Paper text:
Norovirus capsid displays an icosahedral symmetry that is composed of 180 copies of a single major structural protein, the capsid protein (VP1), which organize into 90 dimers. Each VP1 can be divided into two major domains, the N-terminal shell (S) and the C-terminal protruding (P) domains, linked by a short hinge. The P domain is further divided into P1 and P2 subdomains, forming the leg and the head of the protruding P dimer, respectively. Expression of the S domain alone formed smooth, thin-layer S particles without the protruding structures, while production of P domain in vitro resulted in P dimer, P particle, and small P particle. Functional analyses showed that the P dimer and the P particle, but not the S particle, bind to histo-blood group antigens (HBGAs), the host susceptible factors of noroviruses (see below), indicating that the P domain is the HBGA binding domain.
Co-crystallization of the P protein with Ley and SLex tetrasaccharides has resulted in crystals in a new form of space group P212121 instead of the P21212 native form. In both complex crystals the four saccharide rings could be clearly discerned from the (fo-fc) electron density map at a resolution of 2Å, and their structures were modeled accordingly. Most residues from 226 to 527 could be modeled in the electron density map, while residues 295 to 297 and 392 to 394 could not be modeled due to lack of interpretable electron density map in these loop regions. However, in both complex structures with the Ley and SLex tetrasaccharides, the above missing residues could be modeled, suggesting that binding to either of the two tetrasaccharides stabilizes the two flexible loops. The carbohydrate binding site of VA207 is located at the distal surface of the P dimer, corresponding to the outermost surface of a norovirus capsid. The binding pocket for the Ley and SLex tetrasaccharide is constituted by 7 amino acid residues, of which T345, R346, and D374 are from one protomer forming the “bottom” (T345 and R346) and a “wall” (D374), while G440, H441, S439 and Y389 are from the other protomer constituting the other “walls” of the pocket. Extensive hydrogen bond networks were observed between these amino acid residues and the tetrasaccharides of the Lewis antigens. In particular, T345, R346, D374 and G440 interact with the α-1, 3 fucose (Lewis epitope), Y389 and S439 with the N-acetylglucosamine saccharide, one of the two precursor saccharides, and H441 with the α-1, 2 fucose (H epitope on Ley tetrasaccharide) via a water molecule as a bridge. It is noted that 5 of the 7 amino acid residues that participate directly in interaction of VA207 with the Ley antigen are conserved in VA387 (GII.4), supporting the notion that these two GII strains share a conserved genogroup II HBGA-binding interface as predicted previously.
Residue numbers in the entry:
A (entry chain A), B (entry chain B): 226 to 527
The structure:
């Protein structure tokens, strides 16, 4: 029996950045390819892209502080491990290491170290996921920091915080996939792009406004499934009885349905709507499974 | 029926700090009162203390940047809201706001703002959860920052990163509860201290090594239940058929089991062990629910 966990929008976690979901949101996505690599799981529990189940790991990095890069002030070279400590293995059937950012921008966070012994230090750091030498697929990532207080050959962790806007082309683009293998290699093993195929339908996104560390940005980060759904599908591994799980968003306060959504087998939701806008609903509302239908099922407008 | 999710230790999230669990750990906890307020839930789904379900929210704060504290350089007064945006209500049946830190120390992180408009800024911040002024229960919390780039009367978020060790009395003590009401107040609505009551048993902890930002610290943070168990019990609300759920740590690699543990109804686990030490197990190992036993069920040592 297929189920969805009972969660208010305000209890959901974004699957593309480690923060709560702020609102549901829908868009025409005009002139945009929606192909996020985090928050990708089929409803029968297969993880795609760089998707992992830990809800606090996405956009984090871990590894050895190999050296300060020659000829650049306080730019530091990491030799990544996987976030669980296992070594990076570029033969993996993934675009890059699990949890790797799936967007281009100036990722702002903090680089911390423990070592030698139990000595520690941390400072503000920035990773440009759009730069030529950003190549997490093979464990090669650099971070800039304003501090020189870092030890070489000590275990180092990058904790993501938000985006840093300089006001340029290096500006946060949530839909532009990074080149996981650096400027000299092409991406492989990507989770496929998704789009609404039925007329009058749009994708339903779970949107957070991630912190901004500089410049003007609303920090919009849209995921196709909250992390809790990813986790649940992975746990249940229930077999999809059809291409579409029909869901009802219900308001427990009144006992009635607010709208319907098509949860597609491959792990995204559509609703009947038009335009770019938030979907603001009674705080207590939640999705529940109604029935298995086909991809041609017709939804009533949200 | 009662279940627990299938999770490797490395897939678990600490329920007292938003980072993955690093290892299982057990201790005599000699002359220590084990009374964490985060990651507290009964196995039938009742959340206790300051425990919330979101796995990315613990140790975060949200609030208005009221002003800079007079006569003190770059110390800033927050007027907290709840993490959900609602006003702080000191009459809540909680020791303090959900997700509030449950230890005393120099909590290191980043304070960010968005406003006016979509202008943003973020800088390192430290909050001393042990200072007299720390009074989250009534929404009064201060943070120190090395930057003066903060706007008064703009929405402010504190994202936790780790602990800052000055090497003095304000040093991290994971088992010392803060005075949630501030220096002139006694705590209330506390989740109870826990201990092994059966001879030969000790509590099984889920330990993380949280980042240190300065000084010497192992950053040891022990929780009674991974956040995933908290979330599961909350979702399931299954009736506890006895006082103790018997769990077995199984190794899927071999099909053989390694040890058993008693999951007590009030939300902590014990094992038959003696001494302070990590419990290292094959990395693919996980807990499985076996039976409903009582508090006198006798376990083979680990
Ligand atoms: C970290 C840092 O110092 N960054 C600055 C940046 O200021 C930051 O962001 C602005 C918007 C504000 O929130 C500051 O508190 C914050 O530190 C600078 O941006 C300009 O900041 C000044 C600050 O007085 C004005 O607010 C100005 O309007 C900002 O310019 C805008 O944002 C820039 C990033 C550009 O996009 C520009 O076209 C915008 O008008 C910038 C430039 O001075 O420098 C660092 O990035
Ligand atoms: C952030 C910061 O600058 N804090 C310093 C702190 O240095 C930090 O901690 C040490 C252990 C090391 O990891 C540094 O890289 C890190 O920035 C200072 O601590 C001293 O630092 C020097 C190195 O610059 C030595 O390592 C020295 O042993 C450190 O003192 C020890 O740690 C202190 C926290 C005290 O407990 C002291 O008794 C220890 O001997 C301190 C003191 O200089 O000042 C800032 O806080």
């Amino acid at each position: 029996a297929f189920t969805i966990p009972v969660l208010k929008i305000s209890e959901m976690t974004n699957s593309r950045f480690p923060v709560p979901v702020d609102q549901m949101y829908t868009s025409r996505s005009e002139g945009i390819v929606v192909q996020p690599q985090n928050g990708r799981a089929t409803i029968d529990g297969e993880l795609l892209g760089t998707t992992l189940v830990s809800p606090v790991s996405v956009c984090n990095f871990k590894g050895n502080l190999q050296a300060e890069v020659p000829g650049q002030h306080q730019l530091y070279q990491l030799q990544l491990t996987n976030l669980d400590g296992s070594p990076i293995d570029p033969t993996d059937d993934t675009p890059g290491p699990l949890g790797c950012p799936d967007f281009t921008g100036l990722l702002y966070g903090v680089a911390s170290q423990r070592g030698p012994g139990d000595a520690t230090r941390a400072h503000e750091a920035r990773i440009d996921t759009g730069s030529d030498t950003f190549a997490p697929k093979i464990g090669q990532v650099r971070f800039y920091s304003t501090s020189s207080d870092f030890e070489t050959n000590q275990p180092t962790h990058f904790t993501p915080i938000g985006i840093y806007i300089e006001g340029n082309s290096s500006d946060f683009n949530q839909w532009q996939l990074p080149r996981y293998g650096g400027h000299l290699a092409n991406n492989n093993h990507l989770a496929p792009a998704v789009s609404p195929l039925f007329p009058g339908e749009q994708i339903l996104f779970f949107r957070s406004f991630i912190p901004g560390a500089s410049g003007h940005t609303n920090g919009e980060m849209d995921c196709l499934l909250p992390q809790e759904f990813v986790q649940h599908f992975y746990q249940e591994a229930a077999t999809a009885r059809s291409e579409v799980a029909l869901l009802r968003f219900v308001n427990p306060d009144t006992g009635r349905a607010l709208f319907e959504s098509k949860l597609h087998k491959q792990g995204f939701m559509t609703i009947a709507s038009s335009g770019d806008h938030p979907i603001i609903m009674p705080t207590n509302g939640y999705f529940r499974f109604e029935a298995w239908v086909n991809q041609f099922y017709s939804l009533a407008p949200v």
